[PDB]
């Protein structure tokens, strides 16, 4: 689906400095808007830059054995400064996400990463009658995240009971080592309501699985790191409660 | 009373009818709908979305992620295609498990064009050329490069561009084709061969893979709604 | 549903001839070819012999060439893999597959058998 | 003819009306089979009432069809095909019966005994179907609490959305000759809208 | 092709398009000489579009057909009637087909059972089907089949 | 509800009615019709197509191709017609097996004109003259040339023009005639005689044949749809 | 039906030279258009003269014992240069036919030939339940053709179970020895589809049976030859497949 061919190497280093953050993106161009919609305001307190700035999660090692990785939103960013706060001090909250996944290697490494953003991504446990099942804490692995396997999400079953090959229905991009180094996914707020409670309900779900294995030239770096930078877009929350300071 | 006459068909129940019946909850405030991104209008739209084909459904590789990994190994230049595929939807186990096929198992016919996209997943430095070939319906499977070369084929270069897109046209006898196994209306073949060979510098792993995708086009349509659900 | 029943397996001697066969249900064997793939303990999907029902044009793998003989039956919808003069390297769990057709490649097929274990036993 | 450029695709539409959403679900399928009866004897199990929670999740046909999407809004049209018969091999008689079907809106008191007050429901709708005529039909609009019905719900609070509960009993009283009946319910989701599609559930449920 | 009357009439031509209107006259009766009783029945008629799964047992899943139409005719009322438009795969229905691939065109299959369950007194029924080809068009006429079929 | 009253005729089934009933397959894409040559609008059109009459249905010649071959033999000039035919459709075994008659066995009446065309199939060199005669309804069969000569007759010359066309007019008592055997409404006779004789040069075979054709006209119409199909 | 009387002898020799061919027709005038339609293009690759030119089949002897003869289209012309090729290299194909049947005799021979073009002419085998029956090869006798009898097509039953006398419903002309020497039948494409596969389906069927016997003056030529020249009209085929050269 993502049959693009920007250039191949590197051209232009154009940094995204929003608020306090700074990114220095590989370029800027080549981004996918989920379903063709930009995160908009409810048609409330709009913090903007205060909440709307780049936060970086923990970097994870990609290896010749890796089966995949997964995170939840806003869940992961629950331990992020002002966005971490505003999440616990309000009963409401809707937010967009600029999932900017970067992965650098050399002209000598080969493989392919597919960043899949699954809206309402519940994980594997074939009890249709009683879903949710796995405890609040397991279902929410924070900023460190969870991982796929060959709480148990099977890779070819996308960790939900449906053949991986059809995953390509959800918004995605393929970080193919020989071409792109970056993945840009703007995910607008998707839920059954106009606004809801962030602490309990998980909107999206970033799942990066390997479509091609990792092969490194003779002897080189045994593993390569993948980084996930996420940012809250056009967010609002109602309404401050006894700023119950922890 | 107004003279009325009851004709045949009264008191019967047509499952597929369309009649105005009494509304059980008068004045009920229905919650207004919001523009939740991703509204679908028709099924054909889900087909125009490229979906990865599980090419290698071998004994061990089927029902595992390996079914999606077509590996270009280090073997002799034998005009034996690296991969061949039948353009026969439900009459071939490979095109069936695609989102495209998943739409076709709910109809009897299918028309229009289809597009196969191959994405190479090897070292930047690695180079070579391959020949993606198409053989129209009824024609025998192209088993040699020379054979496959004569027909509609694209000479896809690995060295330059990473992704090839070959749009399979509408070369069909009937205006509407069978989604079932029929000889009167049988698909054809899409096969890949070593135009050149694979050239890798230094000591970079000599075996990489290629992924495949399939989707429909604007002219792709379906008919006669049927089902197949078991217990 | 197309069924291929891999029959003719077992633990024979080194040089011990052993024929293989597969009952092809669900289709007209002529529309398809038929071949064989072996896989040694913990190894890879490797080819051995395959021919097309219509043209009966042979094709073998280089290492197996000579000793192995493939032959089709259009009446009983079965293939006969005469694995004659066996060797300790021929100890690989075999498999049969109907082709589109025609030759021994990576996979290039679709219908796969359950798997019959042949072990070229040697003293 | 023969051609493999790389254009968009080729030409424009070619008639795709019978494949559209509304037309994809325009067909009403079986959703459940309720079994009542009019016994003269004290049978507490089959005791007149039959309770069934309104859910598509019970059958397979209409279930998998709805699973290609995550969200939906739909005007639920329901029809009831009632059929009766004598149980005992007796030349016993029975007068044409009346049954009371009850669409009880989600989050209300689910009837237990066929004697309780909740079977009178001053507010809840009811349908008195006399046997031997054209099957009963009611229309329940979008009764969701949210802006859409969530097929697959991620997070915590599977009850799904709750489309209510159906209860049926024989209105006619205790007749010596026991007659058993079976109510077949059908669901037609007219005016249906959907959002964010997922890969179809491959296996069995 | 089963009956003669409507068959020979259609044979004067080679090609045709026609809106097929069908009516079902159901009639019941008791079989055994017993003063046994039965409650007014319901039958389920099924127009299954050509090229679909033909039901075997009256228990199978294909008797639920989420997509295939069905008609619940209660006995004792005006016979059931459905309209099946031109369901041909070609531009016309070919009465006489020359060449290779007699299945003709396949207008589908009809299946009927008693919806009401097992009642001690066995009642047999007979469904008579009628065909009215409204909005009919025809092409290239041949000499009429002189003899018997 | 709107006060309505059920009159007699409700719940009955008239086989020949015309009512709008429910359509089992909503939104089904019907394949558009193409102009395939030879579209028929009405049955009377198939009648205006000349069809060869099997004149000689003799013991051995019937149900064989010879029934279509009327042979002019070498016999004496006897005013005994070479052929005579009754203008009584289903009341005569000859006009019955024609496409014209095949249309008439599906109605009760028939009106208008009819045309008998005789095509000579002998040597170019051969010459002669014949008299095709017509005797209106009720009149006795013309058994002599002189007798047949008096009425409507055409003097068809073999030597010059090969084909004769005699249009039988509408000389009928009733505005609509019986397709059945009735004396109140009985056809008439069409017979051929030796005006002159047959003259053949050299040693060319002295026996040739003549074919006959029959068709309807623009003013030819039918009524009261009936049938006759057996098992 | 064909009650015409051009002249009787010969007037004008006007040759039809299409492409590589040359005919030298008895005249030109007196031709029958099947149903009043000319072979038109689908409303594709149009070869024109390449495919659209005159091809002549094998000449057959007409004798005092002959029962008739029959051919199939495109079947007969399956062994004709470019039209023979284009038939096997394409999955499609629709075509018109100018069946120009010639028969020459003297002012001393007598008889009558009726050239009948039966659209979708299936041959005799009274199995209504299972038609087609006779093998692909028998049903397709190529350019040499098949013959009627007193695979078995009965003459008075037109070789299909219907009385010959009614054959006159199909387009036709009568080559009556004392008048016409030539028969011209333009047959437009007739089939249930817009275009189909020629190799399997037979559109028309040229059937020439004798309506009058053959009688020759004393001692002359014991038999006379009949020739069938057929030509593809306004033809198109889609779409070249691995020009699978034989």
């Amino acid at each position: 689906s993502p049959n693009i061919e920007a250039c191949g190497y590197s051209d232009r280093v154009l940094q995204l400095t929003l608020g306090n953050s700074t990114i220095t993106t590989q370029e800027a161009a080549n981004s996918v808007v989920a379903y063709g919609r930009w995160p908009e305001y409810l048609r409330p307190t709009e913090p903007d830059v205060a909440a709307c700035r780049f936060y970086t999660l923990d970097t994870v090692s990609w290896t010749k054995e890796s089966r995949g990785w997964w995170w939840k939103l806003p869940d992961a960013l629950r331990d992020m400064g002002l966005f971490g706060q505003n999440m616990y001090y309000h009963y409401l909250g809707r937010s967009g996400y600029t999932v900017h996944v970067q992965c650098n290697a050399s002209k000598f490494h080969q493989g392919a990463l597919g960043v899949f953003a699954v809206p309402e991504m519940c994980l594997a446990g074939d009890s249709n009658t009683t879903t949710m099942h796995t405890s609040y804490q397991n279902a929410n692995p924070g900023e460190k995240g969870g991982t796929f396997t060959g709480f148990c999400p099977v890779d070819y079953l996308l960790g939900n009971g449906t053949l991986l090959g059809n995953a390509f229905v959800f918004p995605h991009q393929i970080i193919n080592l020989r071409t792109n180094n970056c993945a840009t996914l703007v995910l607008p707020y998707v839920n059954s309501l106009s606004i809801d409670s962030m602490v309990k309900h998980n909107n999206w779900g970033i799942a990066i699985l390997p479509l091609a294995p990792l092969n490194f030239a003779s002897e080189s770096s045994p593993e390569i790191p993948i980084t996930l930078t996420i940012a809250p877009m056009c967010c609002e929350f109602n309404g401050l409660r006894n700023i119950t300071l922890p | 009373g107004l003279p009325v006459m009851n004709t045949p068909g009264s008191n019967q129940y047509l499952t597929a009818d369309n009649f105005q019946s009494p509304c059980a909850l008068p004045e009920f405030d229905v919650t207004p709908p919001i523009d939740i991104p991703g509204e679908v209008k028709n099924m054909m739209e889900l087909a125009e979305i490229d979906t990865m084909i599980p090419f290698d459904l071998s004994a061990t590789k089927k029902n595992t992620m390996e079914m999606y990994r077509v590996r270009l190994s280090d073997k002799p230049h034998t005009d034996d295609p690296i991969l061949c595929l039948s353009l026969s939807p439900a009459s071939d186990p490979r095109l069936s498990h695609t989102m495209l096929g998943e739409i076709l198992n709910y109809y009897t016919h299918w028309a229009g064009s289809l597009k196969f996209t191959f994405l190479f997943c090897g070292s930047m430095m690695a180079t070579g050329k391959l020949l993606v070939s198409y053989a129209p319906p009824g024609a025998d499977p192209p088993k040699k490069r020379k054979e496959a070369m004569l027909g509609t084929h694209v000479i896809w270069d690995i060295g330059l561009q990473s992704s090839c897109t070959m749009v399979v046209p509408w070369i069909s006898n009937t205006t509407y084709r069978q989604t079932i196994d029929d000889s009167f209306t049988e698909g054809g073949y899409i096969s890949v061969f070593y135009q050149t060979r694979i050239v890798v510098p230094l000591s970079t792993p000599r075996e990489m893979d290629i992924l495949g995708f399939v989707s429909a086009c604007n002219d792709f349509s379906v008919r006669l709604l049927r089902d197949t659900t078991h217990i | 549903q197309v069924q291929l029943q891999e029959s003719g397996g077992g633990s024979v001697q080194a040089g011990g001839s052993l024929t293989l066969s597969c009952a092809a249900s669900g289709y007209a064997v002529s529309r398809y070819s038929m071949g064989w793939f072996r896989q040694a303990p913990g190894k890879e999907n490797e080819g051995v012999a395959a021919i097309d029902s219509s043209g009966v044009g042979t094709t073998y793998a280089d290492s197996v060439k000579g000793r192995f003989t493939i032959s089709r039956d259009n009446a009983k919808d079965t293939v006969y893999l005469r694995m004659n003069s066996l060797k300790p390297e021929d100890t690989a769990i075999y498999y049969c597959a109907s082709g589109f057709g025609l030759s021994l490649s990576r996979y290039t097929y679709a219908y796969w058998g359950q798997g019959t274990q042949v072990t070229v036993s040697s003293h | 003819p023969s051609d493999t450029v790389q254009t968009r695709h080729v030409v424009q539409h070619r008639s795709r009306s019978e494949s559209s959403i509304e037309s994809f679900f325009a067909r009403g399928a079986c959703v459940t089979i309720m079994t009542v009866d009019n016994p003269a004897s004290t049978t507490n199990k089959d005791k007149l009432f039959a309770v069934w929670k309104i859910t598509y999740k019970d059958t397979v046909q209409l279930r998998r069809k709805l699973e290609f999407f995550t969200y939906s809004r739909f005007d639920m049209e329901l029809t009831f095909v009632v059929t009766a018969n004598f149980t005992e091999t007796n030349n016993g008689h029975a007068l044409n019966q009346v049954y009371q079907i009850m669409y009880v809106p989600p989050g209300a008191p689910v009837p237990e005994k066929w004697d309780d007050y909740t079977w009178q429901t001053s507010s809840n709708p009811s349908i008195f179907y006399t046997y031997g005529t054209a099957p009963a039909r009611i229309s329940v609009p979008y009764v969701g609490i949210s802006n859409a019905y969530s097929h697959f719900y991620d997070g915590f609070s599977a009850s799904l959305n709750d489309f209510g509960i159906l209860a049926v009993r024989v209105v006619n009283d205790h007749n010596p000759t026991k007659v058993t009946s079976k109510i077949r319910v059908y669901l037609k989701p007219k005016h249906i809208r959907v959002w964010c599609p997922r890969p179809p559930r491959a296996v069995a449920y």
Side-chain angles (χ1 to χ4, degrees), chain D residues 27 61 83-86 88-89 91 93 131 182 184 186:
Chain D
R27 295 60 181 179
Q61 297 180 170
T83 62
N85 59 355
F86 301 91
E88 59 180 359
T89 303
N91 299 178
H93 300 270
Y131 178 87
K182 298 182 179 181
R184 295 181 177 88
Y186 295 88

Side-chain angles (χ1 to χ4, degrees), chain D residues 76-151:
Chain D
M76 180 181 61
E77 180 180 359
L78 301 178
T79 300
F80 302 89
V81 177
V82 180
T83 62
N85 59 355
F86 301 91
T87 59
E88 59 180 359
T89 303
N90 182 7
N91 299 178
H93 300 270
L95 297 175
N96 182 4
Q97 298 181 354
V98 179
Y99 301 91
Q100 182 179 2
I101 305 179
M102 299 181 180
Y103 177 90
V104 176
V110 177
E112 300 180 1
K113 300 180 180 300
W114 65 277
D115 301 1
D116 62 4
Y117 60 95
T118 62
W119 190 273
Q120 301 299 356
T121 63
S122 59
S123 60
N124 303 1
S126 300
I127 310 177
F128 296 90
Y129 181 88
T130 301
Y131 178 87
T133 61
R137 180 184 299 180
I138 57 62
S139 299
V140 179
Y142 179 94
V143 291
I145 63 179
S146 300
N147 300 6
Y149 298 96
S150 300
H151 297 89

Side-chain angles (χ1 to χ4, degrees), chain B residues 76-123:
Chain B
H77 179 90
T78 305
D79 296 2
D80 180 1
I82 193 61
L83 61 62
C84 61
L85 179 176
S86 300
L87 181 59
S88 300
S91 57
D92 180 2
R94 298 177 299 179
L95 297 178
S96 60
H97 299 270
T98 62
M99 182 61 180
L100 179 58
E102 299 299 356
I103 299 179
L104 297 59
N105 59 358
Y106 292 90
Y107 300 91
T108 303
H109 303 90
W110 60 268
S113 300
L114 301 178
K115 60 180 180 180
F116 299 88
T117 302
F118 297 89
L119 181 60
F120 179 86
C121 301
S123 60

